[PDB]
Design a protein around this nucleic acid. Structure first.
Length: 425
DNA sequence: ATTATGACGCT
DNA sequence: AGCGTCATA
């Protein structure tokens, strides 16, 4: 297998939280704007940045006071705050709208609130059967980029480059110089064009997509041309694409594994991995990672698009950084309640909409001076969707953690509640 | 003082 | 059951 068996798309809503605020407030449209939460500490922390604002150098995880220095005209939208914490309901609801529309076209895996994987293999077959011996016009692919094209001999403008590359691709399909998987990708891209058109018409939200044979290539493809554009990445484009592609760019290699691959093997780019035998890769990085790397540097990935549109867990948390770390038993109880109260509302909605019930409650807390996200995880049975019950049980489970008092030590930097193990209802 | 959520793999 | 990795709004 050349890993050309499937057609897979990754769709990413461009600066999704910004878009949601821009649809609601027309004033923010087509302007440098960012979404922040909690204005009191340094203007608030930016979590979403429009493309107009990015040009000024405004980035995520930046303090709003700092972003205003780069972009004096930056407009800000504030995350809804409920019970003393961030409330993301508006963005979760908008996300559902998008997911439902995507559902009509093909089978979808929800990757995050803003992005989803699409398995288009069956859909492209139908289209290939439905439309037989029919040439694919350039007009059907108005925002599609073919990676690696144009090649050889109005290039100076970006849109000129796009069309010329598209024409070369199409002419080669037309002529029969392009393989059946290349045709499958193209039809896949046609469908993604329509899916994206349906999303914008019906929600007003724009998005970018990558089309390829697996999830990793599709995701890489998606980021090549943004915003509001889609990029086809063929099996043939992979060698040139990987040759100058930093290892950290590939999904799952952005962390410690990727760094160890670079450090151990002494390589910079993804394509350099082809030198090494599978056994060599497995020896260094383990059987599972080795096998995965051997195939992936050749553009082959087998992870399936899971038929899942609903989150597997439902959770809420609040950090209590630095001085605000919780020191009294009463403080700890109160926030657990606030956390439990938001959770109950979300769980009941979930039950009515999605015909399922969570059976387990997980408590995660973090203590002062700990590098790790979570210092401790602990679980209890979840039998009633009741805030007072859930909050009280959560406390019962973690009360032993306290070193000595009714003071609590070490002070809590984080409280986390997660509903898990859903069952059909 | 990146904040709040996620999905997984390992053991 | 509990911990660590990776990811993005």
């Amino acid at each position: 297998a050349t890993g050309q068996d499937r057609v897979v798309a990754l769709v990413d809503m461009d600066c999704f939280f910004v878009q949601v605020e821009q649809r609601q407030n027309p004033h923010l449209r087509n302007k440098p704007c960012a979404v922040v939460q909690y204005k009191s500490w340094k203007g608030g922390g930016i979590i979403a940045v429009s493309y107009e604002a990015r040009a000024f150098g405004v980035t995520r995880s930046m303090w709003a006071d700092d972003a205003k220095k780069l972009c004096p005209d930056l407009l800000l939208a504030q995350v809804r705050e409920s019970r003393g914490k961030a409330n993301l309901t508006k963005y979760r609801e908008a996300s559902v709208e998008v997911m439902e529309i995507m559902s009509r076209f093909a089978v979808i895996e929800r990757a995050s609130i803003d992005e989803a994987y699409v398995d288009l293999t069956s859909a492209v077959q139908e289209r290939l059967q439905k439309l037989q011996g029919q040439p694919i016009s350039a007009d059907l692919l108005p925002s599609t980029y073919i990676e690696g094209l144009p090649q050889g001999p109005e290039t100076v403008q970006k849109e000129g480059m796009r069309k010329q590359g598209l024409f070369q691709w199409l002419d080669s399909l037309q002529i029969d110089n392009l393989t059946s998987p290349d045709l499958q990708l193209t039809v896949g891209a046609v469908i993604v064009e329509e899916m994206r058109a349906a999303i914008e018409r019906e929600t007003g939200f724009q998005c970018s997509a990558g089309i390829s044979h697996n999830k990793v290539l599709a995701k890489l493809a998606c980021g090549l041309n943004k915003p509001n554009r889609q990029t086809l990445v063929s099996h043939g484009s992979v060698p040139q694409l990987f040759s100058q592609m930093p290892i950290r760019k590939i999904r799952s290699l952005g962390g410690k594994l990727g760094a160890s691959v670079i450090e151990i093997l002494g390589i910079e780019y993804m394509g350099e991995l082809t030198q090494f035998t599978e056994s060599q890769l497995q020896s260094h990085f383990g059987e599972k990672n080795g096998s995965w790397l051997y195939a992936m540097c050749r553009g082959i990935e087998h992870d399936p698009v899971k038929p899942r549109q609903l989150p597997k867990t439902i959770g809420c948390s609040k950090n209590f950084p630095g001085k605000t770390a919780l020191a009294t038993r009463e403080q700890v109880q109160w926030w657990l309640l606030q956390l439990a109260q938001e959770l109950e509302e979300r769980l009941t909605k979930d039950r009515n909409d999605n015909d399922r019930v969570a059976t387990q409650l997980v408590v995660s807390i973090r203590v002062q001076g700990d590098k790790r996200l979570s210092s401790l995880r602990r679980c209890c049975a979840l039998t009633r969707y009741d805030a007072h019950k859930m909050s009280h049980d959560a406390f019962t489970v973690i009360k032993n953690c306290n070193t000595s008092g009714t003071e609590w030590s070490p002070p809590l930097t984080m409280l986390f509640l997660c509903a898990t193990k859903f069952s059909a209802s």
